[PDB]
Amino acid sequence: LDLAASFSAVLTRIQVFVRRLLELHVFKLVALYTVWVALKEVSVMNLLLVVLWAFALPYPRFRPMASCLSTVWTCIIIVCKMLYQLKIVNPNCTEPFPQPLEINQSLLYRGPVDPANWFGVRKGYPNLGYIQNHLQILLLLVFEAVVYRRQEHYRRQHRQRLDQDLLSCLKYFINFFFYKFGLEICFLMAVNVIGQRMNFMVILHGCWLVAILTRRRREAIARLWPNYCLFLTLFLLYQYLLCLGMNSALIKWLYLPDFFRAPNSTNLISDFLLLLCASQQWQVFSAERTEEWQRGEPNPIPNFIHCRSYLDMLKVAVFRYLFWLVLVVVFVAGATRISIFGLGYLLACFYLLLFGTTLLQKDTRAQLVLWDCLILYNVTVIISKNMLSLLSCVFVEQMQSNFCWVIQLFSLVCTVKGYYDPKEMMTRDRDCLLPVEEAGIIWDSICFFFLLLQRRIFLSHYFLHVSADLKATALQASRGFALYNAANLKSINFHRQIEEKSLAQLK
Ligand SMILES: CCCCCCCCCCCCCCCCCC(=O)OC[C@H](COP(=O)(O)OC[C@H](N)C(=O)O)OC(=O)CCCCCCCCCCCCCCCCC
Numbered sequence: 001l002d003l004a005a006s007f008s009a010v011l012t013r014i015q016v017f018v019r020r021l022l023e024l025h026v027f028k029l030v031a032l033y034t035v036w037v038a039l040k041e042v043s044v045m046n047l048l049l050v051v052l053w054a055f056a057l058p059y060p061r062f063r064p065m066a067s068c069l070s071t072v073w074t075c076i077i078i079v080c081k082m083l084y085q086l087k088i089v090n091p092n093c094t095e096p097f098p099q100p101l102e103i104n105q106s107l108l109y110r111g112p113v114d115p116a117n118w119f120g121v122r123k124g125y126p127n128l129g130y131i132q133n134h135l136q137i138l139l140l141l142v143f144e145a146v147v148y149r150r151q152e153h154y155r156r157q158h159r160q161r162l163d164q165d166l167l168s169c170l171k172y173f174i175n176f177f178f179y180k181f182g183l184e185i186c187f188l189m190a191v192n193v194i195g196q197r198m199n200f201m202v203i204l205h206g207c208w209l210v211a212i213l214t215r216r217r218r219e220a221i222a223r224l225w226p227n228y229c230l231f232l233t234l235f236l237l238y239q240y241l242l243c244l245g246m247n248s249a250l251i252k253w254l255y256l257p258d259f260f261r262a263p264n265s266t267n268l269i270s271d272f273l274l275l276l277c278a279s280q281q282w283q284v285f286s287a288e289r290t291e292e293w294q295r296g297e298p299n300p301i302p303n304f305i306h307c308r309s310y311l312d313m314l315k316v317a318v319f320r321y322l323f324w325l326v327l328v329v330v331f332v333a334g335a336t337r338i339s340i341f342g343l344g345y346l347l348a349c350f351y352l353l354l355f356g357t358t359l360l361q362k363d364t365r366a367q368l369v370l371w372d373c374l375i376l377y378n379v380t381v382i383i384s385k386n387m388l389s390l391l392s393c394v395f396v397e398q399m400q401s402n403f404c405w406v407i408q409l410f411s412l413v414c415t416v417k418g419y420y421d422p423k424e425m426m427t428r429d430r431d432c433l434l435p436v437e438e439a440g441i442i443w444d445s446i447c448f449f450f451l452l453l454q455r456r457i458f459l460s461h462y463f464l465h466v467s468a469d470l471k472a473t474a475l476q477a478s479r480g481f482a483l484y485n486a487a488n489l490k491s492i493n494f495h496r497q498i499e500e501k502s503l504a505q506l507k
């Protein structure tokens with residue numbers, strides 16, 4: 001029974017660790033699922049719930065009452081939906097003759113609505129699965145309460161060690177992965193929403209992201225973070241209100257409310273994720289975890305290169321052999337997407353490949369200057385692609401069959417589903433050969449991720465010791481040459497002796 005006892009002990013340890021996982025994620029799941037349902041089913045009640053949650057995430061003091069109100073509102077919604085499911089209600093559609101004009105199925109005119117249009121209409125056909133979503137939300141809230149109660153019961157009843165082993169470093173990252181990486185993660189979330197939407201709203205996001213980048217010292221970020229969080233929550237609320245209540249495609253492009261085409265609300269969830277990260281990062285950014293906190297001698301562990309441990313080998317791989325991987329990724333991103341923006345990628349890759357050694361020899365100042373130049377170019381191309389996404393709506397009307405070179409040059413094509421689709425235009429041959437697989441964003445984003453990671457490496461002391469090693473190698477090269485000459489001389493003497501002996505034997 002010793003094996004059974006060991007399994008029971010492992011299960012108890014896993015359960016003890018869990019409560020900790022539930023504290024960070026339980027909150028993330030409750031904020032995320034309600035917003036997902038609210039965007040899935042637009043409603044006035046959903047709008048109120050979303051607004052309350054949106055305010056709750058950036059500010060902690062509003063969390064208690066918001067959590068209290070969540071279950072009340074969800075119970076109210078469930079009860080009122082079951083009440084209106086009895087269909088005891090028993091309830092102008094004037095089509096235009098010839099300002100917005102359309103011919104296909106709409107919602108104002110071409111369909112009968114039992115309320116007016118400005119409020120979401122709820123009717124339960126199945127009457128069982130049509131109210132399941134709110135029930136699931138209530139169940140999740142109950143689970144969260146149960147978790148808190150269990151924690152209360154366990155309250156009443158019942159880093160410097162990183163470098164020794166790889167498992168210790170793994171534990172440290174699991175504990176504080178977000179502590180030192182939150183800023184980069186929220187930057188990546190911003191580019192994620194920008195790539196996903198390709199609307200006018202994400203143009204606003206990108207302009208604000210460049211404003212964040214240009215103040216690259218972290219104290220300016222400290223000054224400007226609360227304003228960004230307030231802007232983000234107000235913007236999300238505004239977008240939800242706009243969703244609830246001239247070519248058709250162009251109208252779609254700008255985020256606006258049209259009965260015939262309604263801007264997708266599923267995409268918004270991605271924007272919400274960005275706010276969550278920013279809000280979470282902000283509390284950490286403010287908190288610093290100061291209650292934990294977990295050139296003579298600023299480098300306690302200079303000797304990664306020697307490699308006495310497994311973690312040392314992984315460390316040297318990260319701090320020494322990742323710059324060239326960055327260069328390879330830059331080249332791949334430039335070459336795979338044949339638009340004229342990867343030509344800049346190719347040129348940058350060539351120059352960096354040629355001068356990487358002397359760049360590493362340089363002090364951090366010029367290195368970060370050039371690296372910031374590269375990152376700025378990358379974000380510029382991503383913003384330019386999102387801006388030229390406007391040439392996806394007023395595209396068929398003009399660009400096709402005229403100014404074809406323009407489209408081939410900048411690789412104009414739509415990648416979002418909120419338009420017609422790729423791989424259909426080629427059916428008609430308008431003598432333009434639309435590049436369908438060409439335009440994309442994932443490679444630019446991944447290059448952005450690698451650039452930020454390398455920039456972080458440059459700031460770290462570890463690179464500084466590696467640079468010292470590079471200086472030493474640059475000094476040695478001449479001695480290496482002389483040793484090579486000595487080896488060649490020894491070999492040639494050996495061969496001469498063997499040949500002479502053979503000739504003597506022949507004689
Ligand atoms: C099926 C699909 C699978 C897909 C898998 C994908 C896997 C992706 C993995 C991505 C890993 C990315 C690792 C990034 C590590 C960044 C390290 C880094 O930036 O360190 C730098 C920082 C420096 O400290 P600071 O507090 O900033 O210093 C104060 C500052 N300088 C000041 O003056 O104010 O912080 C530090 O110095 C901390 C140093 C930590 C060293 C940790 C080394 C980790 C090595 C990881 C190796 C991974 C190997 C994986 C092998 C897999 C094989 C199958």
Ligand SMILES: CCCCCCCCCCCCCCCCC[C@@H](O)O[C@H](CO[C@H](O)CCCCCCCCCCCCCCC)COP(=O)(O)OCC[N+](C)(C)C
Binds near residue numbers: 348366373377
């Ligand atoms: C290598 C940069 C890659 C990203 C940007 C360009 C990508 C394509 C072209 C790549 C050419 C690389 C070879 C040219 C390198 C010149 C040397 C480089 O180090 O210049 C440094 C920095 O020069 C700049 O990086 C010039 C970069 C040229 C391209 C800038 C592109 C920026 C984004 C917008 C592009 C818009 C194109 C047009 C759109 C309509 C200056 O060195 P240093 O004297 O030690 O530092 C001075 C710091 N000061 C100024 C504060 C005193």
